[model samples]
Target: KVFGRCELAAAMKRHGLDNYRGYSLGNWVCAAKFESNFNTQATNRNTDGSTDYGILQINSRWWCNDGRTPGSRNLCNIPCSALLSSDITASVNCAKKIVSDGNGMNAWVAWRNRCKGTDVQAWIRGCRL
Candidate 1:
């Protein structure tokens, strides 16, 4: 499923992306914009054979198990497929573990290059959250 901008922003707020691990709500929104354009089924394959999954694009290498990435850490202890659900709760939960795992929001290069230290408030401008 694809989400409209403010639609995604408000949904994310409900799932605790507001100040998760000191990252702003817009920070998350901006990253999702860059990573997946708010498409829940979004996916990207890494040259290393791991895949990024879902709107948040959680990685199969460490965060979730896709049963395809060899030596996957599965630190989030969830199936990567779980993150692809349109419901988004699993994606949000896994994203939380991503930050909690000590990677900070820096784990996502998209976030680092565009969202980090930027005026990301624009990402949630009309969301009113």
Candidate 2:
């Protein structure tokens, strides 16, 4: 469950993020640490056996590739077994590009502004190219 600074930072950059954005790597690390313990292979299952997949805990099997967007389904196409897939960076990056693509760096901006208080959808909208 260890990642080099360069690797983690690279993963963060793929989502248009940086510590200087204001949230602080310590906060991000703390959050991720608490949530998934920095384990890209973590998976949590619901009572029905449905899973919130991945290290970031994305339930890919639940929806299509772009579930974050409007007109998309939430619990659509991910395989349950793939739930433990070690693809946190890729999952986070794709979500950033597909669901949060419109946000650009503002996604980080929102997190910086107030972590949970920042408008997720609004920031995503404002960041559009």
Candidate 3:
């Protein structure tokens, strides 16, 4: 599911992303925009042999269990493939756990470079969520 900008925003909001850790819905929306362009199936492999998956682009090395990332922790206790699903609940849940466990949204480079410290509300303007 390659979601529209607004649709993705609403989905994240519904899943408790808005202000979950002082990061607003706009912050999340912007990160997804830069990370996966709202594409559920997006995947990228890192030079370190780790892979990122889904709209949030959750990583394989420290997050999900991909079976290939050496010393994999499976911190989220989920398969990497779950992040690529259209439902998004698994991905959202893991993201929340990541923050709940003390990591900030800075877990992703895309979030820091594109979403942090700005009036990201612009990304969700005109969307009624």
Candidate 4:
């Protein structure tokens, strides 16, 4: 598991994901926390039978192939399994694509349900960024 939120932020920054596509670093941080608690290997089956991938929980229903799904768009062009790695580069890149499609972080339901408000300062509280 990731040691802390700071590590995740650092990784994202290293990948040039900070403030990407008009999304603040805190938006990514808060969404990652709620989506997978910053665990790279995290995966969950949605109520709709689709799976969420990695820390950002990109949906397999439309974003990538989960093996069980026969017709995933795989818009990211990387396999869903690739997302479940400590190297978050692929996941962050795919997430950027997702956000670029529209609606910013609202592409993630977790962001809409949990992190959409203005009280997300805690996501970067002690981080030196």
Candidate 5:
């Protein structure tokens, strides 16, 4: 697992995610919390046999290739395992592409369900940007 919220916030800011495409740092933090609790190696397998990967929980269906998941679009041009690394570079790049595809943080269902319209400022309340 990664460090606490403050560290995650710092990392996100360092990655230029504080105000990417008008999404708030709070929103990104909230999404990361709900999706993976800031764990870089996080993975979730759906009953449909698809998997969500890493801190952002990107799906194998369209974003990354897992080999076992047939029909994966691999739009990020990365192996799904790359998303599970602590380094986070590949995952962050894929996430940026996902957001740039036009759904914003709505690309993450966790954001829609747990963060949207919520007062997520606390996600960065005590963090030093």
Candidate 6:
């Protein structure tokens, strides 16, 4: 259980956000709050305007269509209670790519310094080295 936070923090760090120590927890909180309310097992049907899905509130249908198996692409694309694969690592990496635009955590670094009101940017700086 202790590793959960670390795993999340590490993912945030690897995403190249403002600073892990500075904003990881806060940004995560905000993201989670905005997305799933920390419900790692959350899932939703596309009934609302956003049509979000999954634990991190990913728009599963729009992303993750690698097609590793039959309906594998579709499996990952639908709203689900939990992640299908032990690929939490893979999910994190994918998340970084989506959020950072493939620039690694640098995208977050720039975001942190300027995203003043949320203070999420500063929060990132506090967590990371």
Q: Provide TM-scores for the models.
A: 0.95, 0.45, 0.95, 0.93, 0.95, 0.45
Q: What overall lDDT, based on C-alpha atoms, would model 4 receive against the true structure?
A: 0.85
Task: Write the residue-wise lDDT of candidate 6 on 8-79 in tens digits.
Answer: 555545555424334455565445444554445555544432334433555444445422223333333432
| Native-referenced Cα lDDT, model 6 | 0.43
lDDT of 3 at 113: 81
Error of 6 at 122 (Å): 9.0
Candidate 4: tens digits of C-alpha lDDT, residues 68-121:
865667899888999998899889989989999878888888899998986776
Q: Model 5 over residues 1-129: C-alpha lDDT tens digits?
A: 574898888888888888888888899889999999999999999787889999999999899999888766899999999999887678778888899998889989889999999998989998888
Which runs in model 3 stand beyond 4 Å of their true positions? none
- Give a tens-digit lDDT track for model 1, residues 25-101: 88888999999989999999999999999998999998999989998899888889889888889999888888886
Structural RMSD, model 4? 1.3
Candidate 3, residues 68-103, lDDT tens digits: the string is 999768999999999999998998999887767766
Q: What shift in Å separates residue 120 of candidate 4 from its native position after superposition?
A: 2.0
RMSD of each: 1.0, 9.6, 1.0, 1.3, 1.0, 7.6
Q: Candidate 3 has what TM-score? A: 0.95
- With a 3 Å backbone cut-off (N, CA, C), the pairs that clash in candidate 2 are 61-78, 62-75, 62-76, 63-76
Q: Which has the higher lDDT value, candidate number 1 or candidate number 5?
A: 1
Off by over 4 Å in 6: 1-25, 48-51, 65-87, 101-116, 121-129
Residue 13 lDDT in candidate 4: 83
Clashes of each: 0, 4, 0, 0, 0, 20
Residue 16 C-alpha lDDT in model 2: 55
